[PDB]
Amino acid sequence: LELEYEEFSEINDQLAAMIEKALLVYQQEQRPLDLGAVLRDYLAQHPLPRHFDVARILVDQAVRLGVAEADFSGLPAEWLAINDYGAKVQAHVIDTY
Amino acid sequence: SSKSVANIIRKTIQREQNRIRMLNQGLQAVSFGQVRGVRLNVNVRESHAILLDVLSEQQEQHQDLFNSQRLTFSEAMAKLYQRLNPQVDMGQRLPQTIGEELLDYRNYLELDVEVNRGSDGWLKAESGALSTGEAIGTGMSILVMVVQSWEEESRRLRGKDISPCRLLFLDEAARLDAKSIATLFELCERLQMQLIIAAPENISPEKGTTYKLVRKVFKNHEHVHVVGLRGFG
Amino acid sequence: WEEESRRLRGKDISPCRLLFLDEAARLDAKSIATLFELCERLQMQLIIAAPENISPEKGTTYKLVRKVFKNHEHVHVVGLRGFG
Amino acid sequence: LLDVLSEQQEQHQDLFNSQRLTFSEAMAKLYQRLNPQVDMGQRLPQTIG
Amino acid sequence: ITIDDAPYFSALYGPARHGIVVPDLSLVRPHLETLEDCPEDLYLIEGDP
Amino acid sequence: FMPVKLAQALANSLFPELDSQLRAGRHIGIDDLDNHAFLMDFQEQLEEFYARYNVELIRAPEGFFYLRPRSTTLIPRSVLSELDMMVGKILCYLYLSPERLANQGIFTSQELYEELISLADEGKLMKFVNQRSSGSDLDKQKLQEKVRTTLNRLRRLGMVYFLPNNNNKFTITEAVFRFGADVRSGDDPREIQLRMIR
């Protein structure tokens, strides 16, 4: 028969837009950014099933802003908890912008 | 002499067939595209089956060739094997070596890999007759077969309270669809076997640990920024 | 090749241009953007394949699903569109 | 080698007092003439000449 | 059996280490009189081989 | 340069002989222990070596090796007689299940003679001897002669191994399957072989 069609959802693009707008301030003020605190504060704004995607996208946006000078110290970072049910994150603080 | 050798060979063959049959069951109902199962097909070569039967029951017809002290046992085995299937040729190699070949049980077995594809029955696994994902999945299946066999082999040389580690890789994992990845995760989990997979972000498996990589230039030198996530689910 | 044949060809004909790439999923978004701009600047047609829809906002896309059906096989094809 | 073959004795003998070009070298390429180390075969490649 | 349990088992089974497992031990009773060619001390055990 | 393993392979003492045989069209089965092992070990390079001649080195699914020429073959080609194929198909049929109990792998010329005569159509038989022939003793004799001849040809091919004595009794090798029919899911070999024979 004749060909049917199906459409995509843009929810994740919208999510990326909110996160990038919310995060732009850190660069502009060159404020030190800690992934642990930011993830813990930002996951509280969405329900549990969506946390994983939010974490991924937030990390994608955050890493573009500068580097963490501690990485050259030879000292590994710890696994910080960011919500209940037991999710963890590992990252040094971002200092060099 | 004679019958007892046949019995030890038969029991060794039987034990190998049974162990393979046990390994075989762990791979039932694995979904990889249109492939729905994998097997290791084990069979006995005819030219050796008849030899084994003759050595079992017609020994009085050939005892001259066995008790002749001018030649050794392995030579006797080689000469009997040439007496049967006379069309076989020998490549100017010592009969001693052919005898020792007949003494090794593995030479009696024929081995194949088969897959239960789609509407069809069991087919021999040929790379050219499969899609990409089906080929990758079948490869993983055979690899876990090998690992299980090797662990069973060595345990008689290891401490009673030691269980070796098991780990395998997969590069360019984006080539597999979600259903195939679910199947692969189920297999490795049931086999207590660790996995490390690389994908250019196209796949986001919820279970396990994830590492985000970004390469940059810093003080005129290449540097990799790394972030990690885990615990979801 | 096209340049070479300039003399033999009739003045008025420019030959067709087309290439393939299987397992496009091996390329990341930036790489595919580069590839698309290259091929469009050269009026080059492309046919690419990937398990997942790697190009949602460019060109046409088809989705294939295979169904086992009365002891044989049948492929169902449906199109995809950028926005809905 | 093209310069060696192109420019001939009578006029360019005054040019030939340079250390890089001489007549005998055309025959010296006889060594290279016999067999170059070509690898893949299509159509017909044969020799330096 | 592994090397760690080997000494334990060898001590446990003692002289009977090299006996034969035979699940009935009454089927041998008729055969037994014929055993004139055997080790001076033969051990037999009953159980599922 | 040349790949190291290819140089090793063709340096082996067994190569000249096998080369000679191969070029003749001989099929290498599992019977020839050393030759078969040699091919198994060096297939990846021998295939490339013979591709330079526009000739294909194929390993049949049953296990035997043989060469297949292309149209552009560098090796002079030759072709079999109709009678040849007839006989071949016959031998493929005789590679049966009751064969094991009937002959223990060793046949005689008369088995094939009589099978040929019984299973074939008269017309094609005539075509094989001469179209003007008609059910005559002499015709039968000539047919016998031809049978022997073709059989010998086949033995050169490696299809059939004569037992080492002057009498004409032989055994059939697995490579005879090259004559055989196409096999489809669940089809009985006897039926399909007969269907082509007809």
Add this chain to the structure above:
Amino acid sequence: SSTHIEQFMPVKLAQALANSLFPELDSQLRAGRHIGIDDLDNHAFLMDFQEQLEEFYARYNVELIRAPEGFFYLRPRSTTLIPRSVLSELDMMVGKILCYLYLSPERLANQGIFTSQELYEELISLADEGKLMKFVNQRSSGSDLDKQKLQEKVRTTLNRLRRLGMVYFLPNNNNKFTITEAVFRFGADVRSGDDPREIQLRMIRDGEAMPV
């Protein structure tokens, strides 16, 4: 060191076998073709790696030989791995006549181009016509049908010699052809002014020629 070509084969021999000319040449050589000076590519190739080829083919129990006239060919031994065959007496008659034609300065002005009719005329001028006709037919007595049959057999054998590389037809005309030096092998029984019997014995001992 290990995994090094020299372990298994001389470098020059491997270099020769890897050349693009080898398969053609090999195929031809095995088929009995003689190689002269005119087919440069082949000839040059042969010259460059002569000893390696000789050594190679030796494996087969066959001699790669070089005649004084500069042409290469294969001579199998009694233990040869490759079959050996002999030419027919009519082929010899045409061969010795082609040889005399090559030498003849009287016809050198043709620049090597000869016609089947000229060959036939020379042959009948020298050999016993009516006795030679016996090979065409046992009842031959000079009839034109039999003379045409003889001419056709000649045409045929000549075509066979062409395949052996002993004669080349013109690109567009098949009634005319050119000779090559390979024909001198037909003079192997007389190139030395000695006792014919001893020469013949020497030749059969060397594997060059068989009786009938």
Add this chain to the structure above:
Amino acid sequence: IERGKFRSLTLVNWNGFFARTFDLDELVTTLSGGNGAGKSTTMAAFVTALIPDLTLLHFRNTTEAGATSGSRDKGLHGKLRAGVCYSTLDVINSRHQRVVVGVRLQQVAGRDRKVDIKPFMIQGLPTAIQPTQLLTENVGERQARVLP
């Protein structure tokens, strides 16, 4: 000057496709679907239609890419069903001429898994004719048949 373009690709009686027509795009066309859906098969049909040289055609897996294998089987036969098969391309010339190139494919009965190819070309076909309908006959109640 206006460069020519490929309009569409048509498959008939392939493995999994009875009669399907893909409409190509001016710049990029993407095929998606789970493993074994049939994407690589579509690629193979196109290429086949392009270069019918049976000597050349060799469809290896994507894995084992670049290995010169001489495999026993070129991998084309299995992608075809029994009976007659087609693969055709519709092209718009720089001259704005509609031309239909293609091939007739058919399995060969016999132990060897061989294939037969017969190229063909069509010129001047009216713009209203679709290849899918041109290559089939409507027999029965919407149960079309393919025609040789």
Add this chain to the structure above:
Amino acid sequence: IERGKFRSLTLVNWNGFFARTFDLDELVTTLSGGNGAGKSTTMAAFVTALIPDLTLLHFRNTTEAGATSGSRDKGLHGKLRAGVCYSTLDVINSRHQRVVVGVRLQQVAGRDRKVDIKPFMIQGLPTAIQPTQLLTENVGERQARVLPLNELKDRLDEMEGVQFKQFNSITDYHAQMFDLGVIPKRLRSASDRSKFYRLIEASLYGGISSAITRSLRDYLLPENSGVRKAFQDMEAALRENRITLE
């Protein structure tokens, strides 16, 4: 019961990684990043630490996955940096003993691209000390200093109960790894190493491996001695007599 696990992977002074440690998951670890980020580099590190044999090690590109040897470059040299480099694994046995195994890597100077490799093993390390700390000195500069094997041996020997073993041959290294249950089979000989590497690399690139398929019986079936040694002993008297006669 309680199968062992790989715990972490550490890179020091590799191309793009001055000092990095990955904490491996109990079931699945996923590496993710754009093209050229360095994923395959990490797997190269893992396998080279696992099998330090330069005859086998060959990191061909994923495209052209199945071709011949081809170039003389094995693709490893370019992944190192000038100076000293390390790759180490951290493992926990069923006994819960912490063992650290690794190799030291260095670019051999020359026209060609060659590498020098030396295995080592450490046992008894406290749970409080990480590999990166062992292998680097926190000098006043912005970036630490990687310390060679001499400094490392001196630093480790100072610890109480910690043993540092440095191997001269790959065979010894594999023997120790097997005894501690890090690998499923003890690699007797070079052939065993080759088969083990075949397994790993076939898993890495993916697909039905040609080599595994050819020699299926050689991989899946153990070799049994019982059938043989009886007949070697019975045959002995004849063998000696024949040799004496010759």
Add this chain to the structure above:
Amino acid sequence: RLIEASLYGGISSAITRSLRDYLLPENSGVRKAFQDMEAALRENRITLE
């Protein structure tokens, strides 16, 4: 070659190895002049041999 290399993607081993043959076109003007020289060099080869 072209098509197949595009299909499987990547640096095709065969393409790069013979890049001259693929990219550089052939010239008939070159040939016409070279014809003469061709004859001469052939003759020289003859003599040499």
